[PDB]
Symmetry: C2
Subunit: 306 residues, 2 copies
């Protein structure tokens, strides 16, 4: 009756040792300290009166290296001297005179819709919480962020290597959240300006609904499975009309098909039927489709496979 | 629209630094290394072919210090020599020759039904994931644990002090999980033997349902609020007949009533009506009552209280 699924985050210790507090004048938020670089949102430069339409190019011109104060509060505290400052998209790149001795092996990557990542929520340079989210098809995340959380970071892990993919920037009118990749772009079409912004429509993540149906099968809950099949191409035409992402299979889904003996196309048919309603029945304690678990969540948490 | 609530764990770094691998003969699992003590489940002493009815007192007598192999794998790796061994309830207390130099400030506490705690899932002494659960009224948790996860720990955090409350032991018939407190007791009526055990009925955690309804009110979703009230005494008679825990208000629930302007008794009334059905309506994206968020979650995540 319990699926064995939970919202699983990576252990956060490696990333904790990289978090700092960045202060520019009256403004403060979190930064990420890797090697001789500290990354943080560029609106730390912006007066509170100016956040709706800031001119970051002129703000940056007005700054000097001493404009920025960087502190490590956790572990062995440290004051970091800024010796260089640059802007890349919506992020600042501050050069500091000391390399982070706890720099992990890392990369910078962008995450795609439907993919899961771990977030270390920080306030005043101090990690306070960790959670995992799926990047939504409209480039928001359903997170938990308050004033002072900007510069909190999201990441995946491949082995010992941390792949940083997100730095938090803002909350939208519907309560969801968005931020930057570490190439400095904002996810989606968002702007780092405090103004109401058009938000694109969310969608069910089809590949993740398939993963959850396979999780149900692995738990012996298979009432929705029938011989009927919908091809991928036919389902993808259907998805465009019914607020679903288009389905693109992966070896992670294929492993679920093989372990369960249920074809992807059987679950694509099931989804089409279940989207019209569960008819009084339940799947893993839910009466609506679940898209917040990935094929990899299911392989790892239930079958122990990576 | 999105509530701003997520399953939020503590940052796990402090606890990661206390995890070790414990091997006894052919059995391996995880342990918790604090000062010169390593805690682990006592069934590490038990051969696989005897897990269904072990004689732990005789196993313990047969053991020597050299029967146990303890390794720290993460960070500065170490092989820890055992210099004393004892059993307390369902746990072993192994004395080792090195004190953990990363021992945090800590206590041992027991967690109560409805209360949330963070789990660090470990395999072979290596932390692999973190997630949060609430202790169910039947002293199980809806976790994500596989073979080799025993000895994984749960904890709360007050300031800098880690309060260890849970050490993982077993998975039950319905896919849920249970374990020990660090006084050696199993939560609930469970025994650390590989045999089917009666599981008590689960219940809705009334106080957490109240917190969730307040979260909904904080987000503009309050169609279920009426002037009508049910007193705590009347609600608690009803709860015993409808699979709910009895409601016991706390200062943290009182904070939510003040912040929302909605009395506890109004939401007790609502719960009774909602439990008969949402009449095809939704609360924070849900068509059923949610009891996996605590009054403290709502205060901290939505209001930023502590």
């Amino acid at each position: 009756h319990h699926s064995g699924l939970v919202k699983m985050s990576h252990p956060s210790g490696d990333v904790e040792a990289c978090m700092v507090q960045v202060t520019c004048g009256s403004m403060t938020l979190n930064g990420l300290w890797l090697d001789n670089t500290v990354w943080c949102p560029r609106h730390v430069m912006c007066p509170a009166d100016q956040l709706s339409d800031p001119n970051y190019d002129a703000l940056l011109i007005s700054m000097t290296n001493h404009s920025f104060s960087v502190q490590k509060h956790i572990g062995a505290p440290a004051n970091l001297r800024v010796v260089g400052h640059a802007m890349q998209g919506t992020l600042l790149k501050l050069t500091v005179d000391v390399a982070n001795p706890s720099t992990p092996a890392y990369t910078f990557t962008t995450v795609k819709p439907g993919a899961a990542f771990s977030v270390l929520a920080c306030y005043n340079g101090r990690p306070t919480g960790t959670f995992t989210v799926v990047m939504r098809p409209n480039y928001t995340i359903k997170g938990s962020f308050l004033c002072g959380s900007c510069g909190s970071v999201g990441y995946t892990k491949e082995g010992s290597v941390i792949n940083f993919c997100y730095m938090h920037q803002m909350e939208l009118a519907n309560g969801t959240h968005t931020g930057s990749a570490f190439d400095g772009t904002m996810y989606g079409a968002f702007m780092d300006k405090q103004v109401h912004q058009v938000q694109l429509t969310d969608k069910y993540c089809s590949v993740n609904v398939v993963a959850w149906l396979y999780a149900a099968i692995l738990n012996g809950c298979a009432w929705f499975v029938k011989p009927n099949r919908t091809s991928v191409v036919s389902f993808n035409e259907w998805a465009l009309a019914n607020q679903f992402t288009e389905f693109v299979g992966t070896q992670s889904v294929d492993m679920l098909a093989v372990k369960t003996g249920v074809a992807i196309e059987q679950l694509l048919y099931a989804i089409q039927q279940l989207y019209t309603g569960f008819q009084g029945k339940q799947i893993l304690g839910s009466t609506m489709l679940e898209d917040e678990f990935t094929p990899e969540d299911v392989n790892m948490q239930i079958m122990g496979v990576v």
